[PDB]
C-alpha cells in the first residue's frame, strides 16, 4: 500500500500462517512451515486494540431525551428544535463516515508498514548471505538449519 509490502512486493496472504498477523515461512532440508513474528504481532494488536477503544471510549454522552412536543402555535421553535436534531445528526453522520474511512486507511497502512519493517529487519541481518527474490523471500547463500532459521526469526543471526 503506502509502504509497498501488502498487495505489493509481497502480493499474497498466507492462509497457512494461523498464529499471528505478520510472520515467516522457512524452507530448508529439514522441513518447512509458518511462524508468526510474535513481537510485531502483539504490538500491532495492542495498538489496534487501543485505537478501537479510543474511538469508542472518547464518545461522551449524557442522559437525554431528544423528543420535544410543541403545539400548533410553536412551529418556529419546533423547527428550531428540528434544525438542532438534523444539525447534530448531520455532523455525526459526516464524522463517523469519514473517521472510519480515514482510520481504515491508516490501519491498513499500519499493517503494510509493519510488514515492510519486518522484511527489512531481516533483509538487514542476512545482507549478502542471501539473495532477494522480489516476492518477500530470501534464499540463503548457505545452509540454514532450524537453529539458523530460528536465529533470524528472533533477530540473532550470526556473522553476515
Amino acid at each position: 500500500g503506502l509502504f509497498g509490502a501488502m498487495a505489493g512486493f509481497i502480493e499474497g496472504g498466507w492462509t497457512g500462517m494461523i498464529d499471528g498477523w505478520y510472520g515467516y515461512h522457512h524452507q530448508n532440508e529439514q522441513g518447512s512451515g509458518y511462524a508468526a513474528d510474535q513481537k510485531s504481532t502483539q504490538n500491532a494488536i495492542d495498538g489496534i486494540t487501543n485505537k478501537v477503544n479510543s474511538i469508542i471510549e472518547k464518545m461522551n454522552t449524557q442522559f437525554t431525551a431528544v423528543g420535544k412536543e410543541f403545539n400548533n402555535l410553536e412551529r418556529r421553535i419546533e423547527n428550531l428544535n428540528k434544525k438542532v436534531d438534523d444539525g447534530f445528526l448531520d455532523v455525526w453522520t459526516y464524522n463517523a463516515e469519514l473517521l472510519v474511512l480515514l482510520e481504515n486507511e491508516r490501519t491498513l497502512d499500519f499493517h503494510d508498514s509493519n510488514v515492510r519493517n519486518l522484511y527489512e529487519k531481516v533483509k538487514s541481518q542476512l545482507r549478502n548471505n542471501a539473495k532477494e527474490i522480489g516476492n518477500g523471500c530470501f534464499e540463503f547463500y548457505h545452509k540454514c538449519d532450524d537453529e539458523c532459521m530460528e536465529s533470524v526469526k528472533n533477530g540473532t543471526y550470526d556473522y553476515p
Binding site: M6, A7, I10, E11, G12, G13, W14, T15, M17, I18, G20, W21, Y22, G23, Y24, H25, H26, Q27, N28, E29, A36, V52, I55, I56, M59, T61, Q62, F63, T64, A65, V66, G67, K68, E69, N71, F88, L89, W92, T93, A96, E97, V100, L102, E103, N104, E105, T107, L108, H111, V115, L118, Y119, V122, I133, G136, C137, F138, E139, C144, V152
Partner: protein, 324 residues
C-alpha cells in the same frame, strides 16, 4: 534454503471502505454502528416505565373514566403512549401548558395520589352530585374525571365558595383543576346562577383569575361547552387558595410527587417486558457500547449519536488476500 516474511490471510469476507478504495476485504473487522434492538420497551436504569395504553397523559392525570387502571401509577423512568392513546380530555377543552406538563412529569421518583379536596363535605351548600357528562361516560352511564369535581349551583343559589390547601406532604404537589365555559350566557346561569362568575386561584406563586368565556361554538364529542384544564406545582409549605362564584371544576384528587431528573415520553406499540437498559427507543432497547446508532433519531437515556449511516465498519486486521 529460504525464508520469507509475509502476512496473515483467512476465510473472512468482511469488507470495509477506505479513503481510496471501496469494499476492501479484511481479515478482521469491528463494527462501530449499533443497528439492532430487542424490539421491547425496557426499564431505563432499572426502573420500569409507565404504560398508559388507551389513555394519554391528559386522561391519566385528569382521571378519565377509561383510565381507572392507571389510578395506582408508581415511580416510572419514562412514560409510554400507544397508537391507541386517544382517551384524554373526554370533555372538550384546552389543556393549558399541556406539553410543558408532559415534559415535567416524564420522570418521577415517588408519586402519591391523595384526596386534596374531599368530595364528601368540602363544598356544603353546593351541588357536588350532578357533575357528570355523556362525553365522559363510564360503561354506558354518564360520568366524569376521577380527580376533578364538577361543582354546580345548589337549588337556585351559587354562593361564593372558598377553600385552601397547604402542602405538608414534604414534596411538590401537582394540583389540577378546570374552568367550565358554557356556550351561552343562558347556561352560565342555569348552572352557576351568577352571570358574572369568576374563579380565582391563589398561591405564593400564582394569581391568574378566570371568568367564563361564553361563546357560540361547535359541539365536540357531544357538548358545545368547554373545559380548560389547568395545573401548578405547589411548593412545600405553600398554600393554594381557590374561591369562585361559578364555573369551577375543583381539584378532587391531587398528586404528591418527587421529581429529580427529567426524561421523556416514548410512543410505541412494542411490548413492555422486564429488561434493563441505559438507552431506550420506540422500536426497542439499543446498546450503549458503540459510538453510533441508526435505529431511531428519537431516544431516551445515554445513547450512541444517531447517524444516517447503514455501515460503519472499522478494520482491525489487514487486507485479506488468500489463495494457495
Amino acid at each position: 534454503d529460504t525464508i520469507c516474511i509475509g502476512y496473515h490471510a483467512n476465510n473472512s469476507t468482511d469488507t470495509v471502505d477506505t479513503v481510496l478504495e471501496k469494499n476492501v476485504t479484511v481479515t478482521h473487522s469491528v463494527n462501530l454502528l449499533e443497528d439492532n434492538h430487542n424490539g421491547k420497551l425496557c426499564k431505563l436504569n432499572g426502573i420500569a416505565p409507565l404504560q398508559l395504553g388507551k389513555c394519554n397523559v391528559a386522561g391519566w392525570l385528569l382521571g378519565n373514566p377509561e383510565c381507572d387502571l392507571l389510578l395506582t401509577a408508581n415511580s416510572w423512568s419514562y412514560i409510554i403512549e400507544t397508537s391507541n392513546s386517544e382517551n384524554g380530555t373526554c370533555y372538550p377543552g384546552e389543556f393549558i401548558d399541556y406539553e410543558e406538563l408532559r415534559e415535567q412529569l416524564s420522570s418521577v421518583s415517588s408519586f402519591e395520589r391523595f384526596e386534596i379536596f374531599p368530595k364528601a363535605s368540602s363544598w356544603p351548600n353546593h351541588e357536588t352530585t350532578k357533575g357528570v357528562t355523556a362525553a365522559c361516560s363510564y360503561f354506558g352511564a354518564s360520568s366524569f374525571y376521577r380527580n376533578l369535581l364538577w361543582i354546580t349551583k345548589k337549588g337556585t343559589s351559587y354562593p361564593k365558595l372558598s377553600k385552601s390547601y397547604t402542602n405538608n406532604k414534604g414534596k411538590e404537589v401537582l394540583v389540577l383543576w378546570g374552568v367550565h365555559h358554557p356556550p351561552t350566557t343562558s347556561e352560565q346561569q342555569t348552572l352557576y346562577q351568577n352571570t358574572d362568575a369568576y374563579v380565582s386561584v391563589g398561591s405564593s406563586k400564582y394569581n391568574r383569575r378566570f371568568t367564563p368565556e361564553i361563546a357560540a361554538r361547535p359541539k365536540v364529542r357531544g357538548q358545545a361547552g368547554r373545559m380548560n384544564y389547568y395545573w401548578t406545582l405547589l411548593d412545600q409549605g405553600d398554600t393554594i387558595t381557590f374561591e369562585a362564584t361559578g364555573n369551577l371544576i375543583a381539584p378532587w384528587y391531587a398528586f404528591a410527587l418527587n421529581k429529580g431528573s427529567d426524561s421523556g415520553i416514548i410512543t410505541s406499540d412494542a411490548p413492555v417486558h422486564n429488561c434493563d437498559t441505559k438507552c431506550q427507543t420506540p422500536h426497542g432497547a439499543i446498546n450503549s457500547t458503540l459510538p453510533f446508532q441508526n435505529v431511531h433519531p428519537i431516544t431516551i437515556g445515554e445513547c450512541p449519536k444517531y447517524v444516517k449511516s447503514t455501515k460503519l465498519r472499522m478494520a482491525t486486521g489487514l487486507r485479506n488476500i488468500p489463495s494457495i
